[PDB]
Amino acid sequence: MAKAAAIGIDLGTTYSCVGVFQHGKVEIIANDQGNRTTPSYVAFTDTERLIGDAAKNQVALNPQNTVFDAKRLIGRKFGDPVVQSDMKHWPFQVINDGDKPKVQVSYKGETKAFYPEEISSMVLTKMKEIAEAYLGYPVTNAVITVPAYFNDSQRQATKDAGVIAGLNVLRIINEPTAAAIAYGLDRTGGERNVLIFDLGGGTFDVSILTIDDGIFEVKATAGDTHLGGEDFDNRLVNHFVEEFKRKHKKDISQNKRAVRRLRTACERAKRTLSSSTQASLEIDSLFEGIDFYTSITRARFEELCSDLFRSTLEPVEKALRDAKLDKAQIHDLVLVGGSTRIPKVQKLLQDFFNGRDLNKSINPDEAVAYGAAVQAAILIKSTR
Ligand SMILES: C=CC(=O)OCCC[C@H]1O[C@@H](n2c(NCc3ccc(Cl)cc3)nc3c(N)ncnc32)[C@H](O)[C@@H]1O
């Protein structure tokens, strides 16, 4: 009978996504909870190891032993100043083992340490499993995506993570390249410059690629490793903490549960503001038994985040300088990442490019896995 399909995996910093190309189209595969993306989280508890949604769901009750952001560590030396800085903000412990970082947790009443690629292999095992549940057979072939700025060590560590997960890694391909492939930008048949604008939950990446007769070349990478959707959630939280202080003469900041409930409501209101011009938040007994009701306009949220949204143009200008290109030399614009749904973000980018269209019809959280699935089917065909 027909041979097993190959899968395309977007191994993201905080979320992952798996796709399969069958019958001339991409199927993004839903997980056991019916979700088209899965958190890249591994939680270690007194009795089990949780991966994906189950791990993300219990993070508030187990922060020291719920690992995320292993992609920020992967292929890096412990001594890397990026590792040393990032370590200061994680709830989990990072240890040194011969200039190699290991995440250290408590698991089944014992201290255990894992290399970043071991954590990533667990998230890859989950994506493999999600695909197998849908396909009804074992999956062994995969394309895995990485950021375009990844060096030899980071690319290799990701490949190691796939081989530990029991995958034959067909190719490690760049995330912006996968996004360009999802939009069929390699199927035009001369040379074109493409810009990928990737704004996620906690990272911002700009990449400039050249496409010449289906061949891709990375021309520039720029961005801000600590800029994303969470920062816009932070601006809303700070605004409402101040509004509560003004209206009730109480500071909710020192109550961990109140701050979490407020943050969760702020992230939901922010998403509403991408399709509505106003959003209401209501939280019963937020603090001191007070039911908190509030409202915010899209205009006020845009003002609260003005400098952050406006700062996304600096890596665009920077990538253009590095690629030695004028903005008029960019043929295609591609949006990736959940935060690109923000109207003001789209407006800033489009206006900067003198009204050029944005390639955004493919769900921005699924575009990379979509392109990885397309490329996996081409590569498994050639290898066979
Ligand atoms: C959730 C699955 C997933 O893979 O997330 C990856 C992207 C995560 C980041 O992207 C942000 N973001 C998103 N995300 C998609 C989303 C989120 C949650 C739900 Cl319930 C549904 C859909 N949509 C948005 C929207 N309409 N406007 C503004 N920011 C939006 C979200 O606040 C977070 O900073």
DSSP string, 284-313: EEEETTEEEEEEEEHHHHHHHTHHHHHTTH
Residue 35 is encoded by which pair of tokens?
């979700």
- Residue carrying the six token digits 């845009």: 302
Per DSSP (E only), the strands in the chain are 7-11, 15-22, 25-28, 38-39, 42-44, 49-51, 66-67, 93-96, 101-107, 110-114, 141-146, 168-174, 191-199, 204-212, 215-224, 278-287, 290-297, 332-336
Q: Which amino acids bring their CB within 6 angstroms of ligand 1?
A: 15, 37, 200-201, 228-229, 267, 270-271, 274, 338-339, 341-342, 365
Pairing of strands 7-11, 141-146: parallel
Please state, in angstroms and rounded to a whole number, the distance separating the CA atoms of residues 340 and 320: 20
- Alpha carbon 152 to its chain's center: 21
Residues 6+ apart with CB under 8 A from 248: 288, 290
Q: Measured in angstroms, how far is the CA atom of residue 215 from the centroid of ligand 1?
A: 32
Nearest ligand 1 atom to alpha carbon 230: 34
44, 111, 250 from 261: Cα distances, Å: 24, 31, 16
Are the C-beta atoms of 362 and 341 separated by less than 8 Å?
Answer: no
Query: Considering only CA atoms, which residue is closest to atom 7 of ligand 1?
Result: 338
Please state, in angstroms and rounded to a whole number, the distance separating the CA atoms of residues 198 and 168: 28
- Known catalytic residues are 10, 71, 175, 198
Q: Measured in angstroms, how far is the CA atom of residue 268 from the centroid of ligand 1?
A: 9
Query: Considering only CA atoms, which residue is closest to atom 10 of ligand 1?
Result: 338
- What does CATH list as the number for 228-311? 3.90.640.10
Residue 126 is encoded by which pair of tokens?
């989950």
Beta-carbon count within 10 A of 256 CB: 9
Please state, in angstroms and rounded to a whole number, the distance separating the CA atoms of residues 344 and 351: 10
Residue of 56, 235, 271, 272 with the most ligand 1 atoms within 8 Å of its CB, for mutation = 271
Tell me the β-bridge partners of 22: 25
Are the C-beta atoms of 73 and 151 separated by less than 8 Å?
Answer: no
Residues 6+ apart with CB under 8 A from 42: 49, 50, 51, 55, 66, 67, 68, 70, 119, 122, 123
Residue 330 is encoded by which pair of tokens?
């960019």
- What does CATH list as the number for 1-67+123-187+360-380? 3.30.420.40
131, 138, 161, 384 from 377: Cα distances, Å: 14, 16, 21, 11
Residue of 339, 346, 363 with the most ligand 1 atoms within 8 Å of its CB, for mutation = 339
Beta-carbon count within 10 A of 284 CB: 10
101, 332, 383 from 70: Cα distances, Å: 10, 32, 31
Residue 221 is encoded by which pair of tokens?
């990478």
To one decimal place, what's the resolution in Å? 1.9
Query: Considering only CA atoms, which residue is closest to atom 12 of ligand 1?
Result: 338
- Residue carrying the six token digits 């407020």: 262
Please state, in angstroms and rounded to a whole number, the distance separating the CA atoms of residues 122 and 68: 12
Please state, in angstroms and rounded to a whole number, the distance separating the CA atoms of residues 279 and 329: 39
SS3 call for 26: strand
Contacts of 292-299 with CB under 8 Å at 24 or more apart are 292/240, 292/244, 292/262, 294/240, 294/243, 296/236, 296/239, 296/269, 298/273, 298/343
155 annotated binding-site participant? no
Query: Considering only CA atoms, which residue is closest to atom 9 of ligand 1?
Result: 201
Q: Where in the chain is the domain with CATH 3.30.30.30?
A: 68-122
272 annotated binding-site participant? yes
Are the C-beta atoms of 287 and 297 separated by less than 8 Å?
Answer: no
- Alpha carbon 85 to its chain's center: 20
Query: Considering only CA atoms, which residue is closest to atom 33 of ligand 1?
Result: 201
Q: Where in the chain is the domain with CATH 3.30.420.40?
A: 1-67+123-187+360-380, 188-227+312-359
42, 235, 251, 290 from 238: Cα distances, Å: 29, 5, 11, 18
Residue 31 is encoded by which pair of tokens?
């997980």
Rounded to the nearest 10 degrees, how much is the dihedral formed by the CA atoms of 285, 287, 290, 295? -90
Q: What is the CATH class of 188-227+312-359? A: alpha beta
Handedness of CA 338, 342, 347, 352 (dihedral sign): negative
Region of residue 288 (left: phi > 0; alpha: psi -120 to 50; beta: else): left
Please state, in angstroms and rounded to a whole number, the distance separating the CA atoms of residues 298 and 384: 52
Residues 6+ apart with CB under 8 A from 332: 180, 183, 185, 192, 193, 194, 195, 359
Residues 6+ apart with CB under 8 A from 313: 348, 349, 352
Which residues does the chain break after (C to N > 2.5 Å)? 189
Residue of 230, 365, 368 with the most ligand 1 atoms within 8 Å of its CB, for mutation = 365
Nearest ligand 1 atom to alpha carbon 274: 27
Query: Considering only CA atoms, which residue is closest to atom 20 of ligand 1?
Result: 268
Residue 354 is encoded by which pair of tokens?
């003198």
Nearest ligand 1 atom to alpha carbon 17: 4
Q: Measured in angstroms, how far is the CA atom of residue 367 from the centroid of ligand 1?
A: 14
38 annotated binding-site participant? no
Region of residue 24 (left: phi > 0; alpha: psi -120 to 50; beta: else): left
- What does CATH list as the number for 68-122? 3.30.30.30
Q: Measured in angstroms, how far is the CA atom of residue 10 from the centroid of ligand 1?
A: 16
Nearest ligand 1 atom to alpha carbon 202: 34
Residues 6+ apart with CB under 8 A from 133: 32
Burial class (CB in 10 A: 0-12, 13-18, 19+), 47: exposed
